[PDB]
Amino acid sequence: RLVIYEREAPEGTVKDIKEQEVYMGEIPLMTDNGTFVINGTERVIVSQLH
Amino acid sequence: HARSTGSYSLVTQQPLGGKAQFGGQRFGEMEVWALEAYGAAYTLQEMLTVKSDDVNGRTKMYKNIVDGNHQMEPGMPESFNVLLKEIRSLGINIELEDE
Amino acid sequence: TPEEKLLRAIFGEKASDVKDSSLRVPNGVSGTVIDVQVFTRDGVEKDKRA
Amino acid sequence: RVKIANRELEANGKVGATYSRDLLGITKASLATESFISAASFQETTRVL
Amino acid sequence: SQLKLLVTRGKEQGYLTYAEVNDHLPEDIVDSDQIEDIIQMINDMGIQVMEEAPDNTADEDAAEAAAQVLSSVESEIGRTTDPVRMYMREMGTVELLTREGEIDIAKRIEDGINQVQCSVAEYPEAITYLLEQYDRVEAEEARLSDLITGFVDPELAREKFAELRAQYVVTRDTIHATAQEEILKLSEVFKQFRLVPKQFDYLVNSMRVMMDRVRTQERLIMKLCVEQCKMPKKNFITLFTGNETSDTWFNAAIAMNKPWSEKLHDVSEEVHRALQKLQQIEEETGLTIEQVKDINRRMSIGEAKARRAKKEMVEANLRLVISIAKKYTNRGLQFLDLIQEGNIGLMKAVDKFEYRRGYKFSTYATWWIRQAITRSIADQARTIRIPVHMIETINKLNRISRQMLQEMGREPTPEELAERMLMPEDKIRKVLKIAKEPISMETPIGDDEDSHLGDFIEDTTLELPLDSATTESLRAATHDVLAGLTAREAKVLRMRFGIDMNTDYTLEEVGKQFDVTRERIRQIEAKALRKLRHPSRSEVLRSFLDD
Amino acid sequence: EEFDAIKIALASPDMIRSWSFGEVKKPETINYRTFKPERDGLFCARIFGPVKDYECLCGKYKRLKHRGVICEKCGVEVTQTKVRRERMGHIELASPTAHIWFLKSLPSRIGLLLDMPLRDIERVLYFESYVVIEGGMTNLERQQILTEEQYLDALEEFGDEFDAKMGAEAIQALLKSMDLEQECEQLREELNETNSETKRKKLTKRIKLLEAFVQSGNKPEWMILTVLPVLPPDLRPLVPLDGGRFATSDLNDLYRRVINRNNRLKRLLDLAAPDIIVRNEKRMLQEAVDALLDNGRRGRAITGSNKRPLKSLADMIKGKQGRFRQNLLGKRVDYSGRSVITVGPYLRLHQCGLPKKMALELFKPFIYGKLELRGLATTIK
Numbered sequence A: 001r002l003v004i005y006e007r008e009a010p011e012g013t014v015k016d017i018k019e020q021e022v023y024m025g026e027i028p029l030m031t032d033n034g035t036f037v038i039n040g041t042e043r044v045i046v047s048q049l050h
Numbered sequence B: 001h002a003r004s005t006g007s008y009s010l011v012t013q014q015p016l017g018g019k020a021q022f023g024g025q026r027f028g029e030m031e032v033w034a035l036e037a038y039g040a041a042y043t044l045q046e047m048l049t050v051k052s053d054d055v056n057g058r059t060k061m062y063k064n065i066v067d068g069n070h071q072m073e074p075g076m077p078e079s080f081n082v083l084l085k086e087i088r089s090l091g092i093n094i095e096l097e098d099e
Numbered sequence C: 001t002p003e004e005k006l007l008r009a010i011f012g013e014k015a016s017d018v019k020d021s022s023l024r025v026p027n028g029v030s031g032t033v034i035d036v037q038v039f040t041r042d043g044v045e046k047d048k049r050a
Numbered sequence D: 001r002v003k004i005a006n007r008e009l010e011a012n013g014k015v016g017a018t019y020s021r022d023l024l025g026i027t028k029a030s031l032a033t034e035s036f037i038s039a040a041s042f043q044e045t046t047r048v049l
Numbered sequence E: 001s002q003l004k005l006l007v008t009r010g011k012e013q014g015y016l017t018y019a020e021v022n023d024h025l026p027e028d029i030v031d032s033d034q035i036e037d038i039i040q041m042i043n044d045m046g047i048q049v050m051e052e053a054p055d056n057t058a059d060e061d062a063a064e065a066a067a068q069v070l071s072s073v074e075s076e077i078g079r080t081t082d083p084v085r086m087y088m089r090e091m092g093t094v095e096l097l098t099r100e101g102e103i104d105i106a107k108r109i110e111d112g113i114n115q116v117q118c119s120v121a122e123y124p125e126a127i128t129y130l131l132e133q134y135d136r137v138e139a140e141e142a143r144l145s146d147l148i149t150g151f152v153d154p155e156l157a158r159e160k161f162a163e164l165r166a167q168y169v170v171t172r173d174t175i176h177a178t179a180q181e182e183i184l185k186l187s188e189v190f191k192q193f194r195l196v197p198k199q200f201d202y203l204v205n206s207m208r209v210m211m212d213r214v215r216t217q218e219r220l221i222m223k224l225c226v227e228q229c230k231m232p233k234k235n236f237i238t239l240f241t242g243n244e245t246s247d248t249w250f251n252a253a254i255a256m257n258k259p260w261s262e263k264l265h266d267v268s269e270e271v272h273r274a275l276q277k278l279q280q281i282e283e284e285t286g287l288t289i290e291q292v293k294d295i296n297r298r299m300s301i302g303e304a305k306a307r308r309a310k311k312e313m314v315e316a317n318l319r320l321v322i323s324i325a326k327k328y329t330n331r332g333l334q335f336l337d338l339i340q341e342g343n344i345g346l347m348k349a350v351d352k353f354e355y356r357r358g359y360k361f362s363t364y365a366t367w368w369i370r371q372a373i374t375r376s377i378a379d380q381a382r383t384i385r386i387p388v389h390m391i392e393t394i395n396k397l398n399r400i401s402r403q404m405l406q407e408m409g410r411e412p413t414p415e416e417l418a419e420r421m422l423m424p425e426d427k428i429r430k431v432l433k434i435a436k437e438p439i440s441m442e443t444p445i446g447d448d449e450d451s452h453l454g455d456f457i458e459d460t461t462l463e464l465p466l467d468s469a470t471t472e473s474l475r476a477a478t479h480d481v482l483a484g485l486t487a488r489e490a491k492v493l494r495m496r497f498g499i500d501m502n503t504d505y506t507l508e509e510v511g512k513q514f515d516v517t518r519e520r521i522r523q524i525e526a527k528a529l530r531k532l533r534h535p536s537r538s539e540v541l542r543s544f545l546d547d
Numbered sequence F: 001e002e003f004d005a006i007k008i009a010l011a012s013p014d015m016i017r018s019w020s021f022g023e024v025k026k027p028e029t030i031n032y033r034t035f036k037p038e039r040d041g042l043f044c045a046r047i048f049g050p051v052k053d054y055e056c057l058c059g060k061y062k063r064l065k066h067r068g069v070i071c072e073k074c075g076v077e078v079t080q081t082k083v084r085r086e087r088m089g090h091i092e093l094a095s096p097t098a099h100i101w102f103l104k105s106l107p108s109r110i111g112l113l114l115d116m117p118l119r120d121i122e123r124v125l126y127f128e129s130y131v132v133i134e135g136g137m138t139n140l141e142r143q144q145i146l147t148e149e150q151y152l153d154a155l156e157e158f159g160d161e162f163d164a165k166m167g168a169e170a171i172q173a174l175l176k177s178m179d180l181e182q183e184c185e186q187l188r189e190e191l192n193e194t195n196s197e198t199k200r201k202k203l204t205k206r207i208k209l210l211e212a213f214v215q216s217g218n219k220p221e222w223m224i225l226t227v228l229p230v231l232p233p234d235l236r237p238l239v240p241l242d243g244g245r246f247a248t249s250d251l252n253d254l255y256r257r258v259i260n261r262n263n264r265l266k267r268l269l270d271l272a273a274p275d276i277i278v279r280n281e282k283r284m285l286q287e288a289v290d291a292l293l294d295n296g297r298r299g300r301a302i303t304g305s306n307k308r309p310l311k312s313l314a315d316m317i318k319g320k321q322g323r324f325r326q327n328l329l330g331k332r333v334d335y336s337g338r339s340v341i342t343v344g345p346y347l348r349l350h351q352c353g354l355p356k357k358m359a360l361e362l363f364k365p366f367i368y369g370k371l372e373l374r375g376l377a378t379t380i381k
């Protein structure tokens, strides 16, 4: 939601709120078995310990 | 796995095969220590001059093997020739005396 | 080359312009071709088997 | 080197060189070599070169 | 001493930690480049290794010099390396504004250029050169726009050079009383022309010939009088300045009861030659040697001031160049390459700026800097160089691919870029095949013992040694088959092909040395192929055609 | 060629010219469209020999017999493409440049050959601080370093007989202006008159070094590269990987960088640009070279488009993966095999089993020979 406030205004009256939906990335979903599929092959992300 | 004459590398004329590492077993360093421990030195010379690198040595070895004359004509390893070139690109004039 | 050329002269066998590179089975396996899939760039006319 | 040199010199009439032997670690006794294509296999290559 | 206490604890312990070395550092030197310099001096000497939080042999014999370098870098630092920072230091020493005095510096530059052009207007050889070039150019051997890039319609230009011929005939063929005024009018007219850069280049070139000839005859007069003849500067300046042209200050000098004069007897005719070629160059121009030397020294000093104005303004604007070059830092080209390319573009900007156009300088020169760095990023960044507008197409595809990647939501297809971009639907494919970098052939594919990707790239120039053996075996076999023919037969069939000789031969040379280029050797050949194609003979030869 | 020992010495600029086969002049590598190599870039045809066996680049001469001829179109010697593996190219550097091995090996070879602290030399190269060379019997010694104001003052002190450089030209002047046997005799004096065991100890140390250097065949000014050689074009390849992605080695990158900056520096010098510009350029070229010869020893690898500190010449001999240890001792081996083992007690301890298939693939050449000898098959095919 891109808002632009007016100059001569810290939080003075808003002059535009152009609300548009933007794409970003493709999060590889999880299969029912906790095994993603990244390039055709079934891959698994091992838990880390730090 | 077994490999008699497969493909070869591109920077150093060594064996390199792919298919199931279709290339010779790594005749590493400790094996060279082994052969020097025995007095055997011909087998070493051909283990890294005829069978492996010297890109005229190997084809002459194959011509000899097919023509039933188990000789060998070694030459000089292509890896050491690459080493001469890589030392010489640096300003280090390495040459081989001839006598 | 040399005498290879003499040979082609001797038997007139047209030396082909094409180089064989067919996908031949790896030396050793012995199997049953259970399933053939043919992906195609969509800039080519799909052949008969596809 | 010293033993051949002063041994031949004592073979002639002159006198050699009284030397006091040393003892070196193997990583330090392999560190000195007449030949460098050997000594560049395992040492730091840049310094030998 | 303190870092040397570090070294003694390292000799005793045999290792360190970053807390240790970070604790024994001199209490101001926290340059990460400098920190690495000292850390490498500490490590590489042995102590080895610096060992972050320990808890095997070591090889080194030159630790004493390293220790000395450390104990020297303690008090007075080994200040800076990493030449980006060296350049930052060396350009930051500037009063980094030229506020409304830029036009003063440009006043200075106009001074230099105008002095050199006026001196040129004093110069005979270049005026004669432009007259001779007027003749040649009028001979269809050149454009009227190449000899001159306009003045302040080259037919007007032709009447202009005709005006030059008029002024120069009146000014030259009256050789003092009025000739000076003639040069004055020629001055007033040539001060308003305008030359191509390489035109003033050749102007300066013949003038540099002039100054170099004059200085070399200076050597011919001095090293034949001053150095060769013990001639001091007193009696030499007494007699050089004042004539410098006629031979009245040398051979009259030899008879002057002087030390040098009593020895110049054996340097007489060479000095006569010196002054004679001197007056010969004069003939090439028509003025005294001192006029030439003063004129081109005025030229050289205006030129020095002009170069100096160049240096000064550009070192004022290097801050501008760095700020602007920061913006392209991942085009695939190093920071300092970008900043130097920008400096060159800045130099061209200072080359052709005028205050009589009203621009301000930063807003003006930003464009030149950016355009030059863009030309650079196009021309010498990609390994396999590709032309400029090709990169244009690549940047077009990238902009439109970002835009289509969210306009259509999922991701674009070449069939669709071939209609957003109005390109022919196939240049997009080829551009998308070409525009990618090459992989660093020593890339680690750690998936194995330890390899680099160059270690797998197989070969394809080699011949399979089966092929080598077959070729040799067939050389031998064909040798035997040619043993199955006659001198005419075997020699003709060899020479007809590449058999054990040099490059093959056709019927011309063949029938030449065989005396018949006709159906004669044709019948020989055809019957040869007849007997050879005869089975029970060529069965082995057909066996060499395995298939 | 059963030759001899190996000899090694320094790189005579005449030597590096006579090795070469034609100047490199441009950072182009190939043509992006018809994948022949540009002329005359890091790759080439008129320099490093042809691409295709016994074919010119342009294609004018294409036969085995024509070898020895250089084309009239692009001067490419019709000669085996494996000559593309043994040629070298000089780069006629515009500004002289110091060889990093001989300046960062601890000691400085240039240092203790000049008898000068390493800090002052890295001053004189990187252009922090002028250095006098043969300052005359006026006020100054020889090695005396200076600074900006100090030099610009001393010019006033003596207009002439005042010889102060800075940059690789400075070190090279110091080296060539040096003469060694004078230092040998002065060192013999210092061993005679001066008497303190550390003093005449390092006296013998430096005198041994200097007379050993003169006993060598070398010279002094060969430690300053005037002519850098380029490795050939087939030890630093540009393979076509299947798919347009070319997989180049990294020396192509390094050479292309050093050649870029050499070109640009020649261009700067021609324009008569101001001094800070040329100084930054000579620093940039010095670091490009110092990355080319080692990519190390100098503070930061000029890392490639990875985060990988990109590999370089002394990095292709160094390390357990370099040519010495990794491929000049432990190489692969034709005619071998390997497999899972088993027991088989039915043997005698001088003989092992060996599978039929592995036997037939190890001993292919001997088998071929035995077959065509016994006549059971006409030819090797």
Ligand SMILES: [Zn+2]
Pocket: F056, F057, F058, F059, F060, F071, F072, F073, F074, F075, F076
């Ligand atoms: Zn050609």
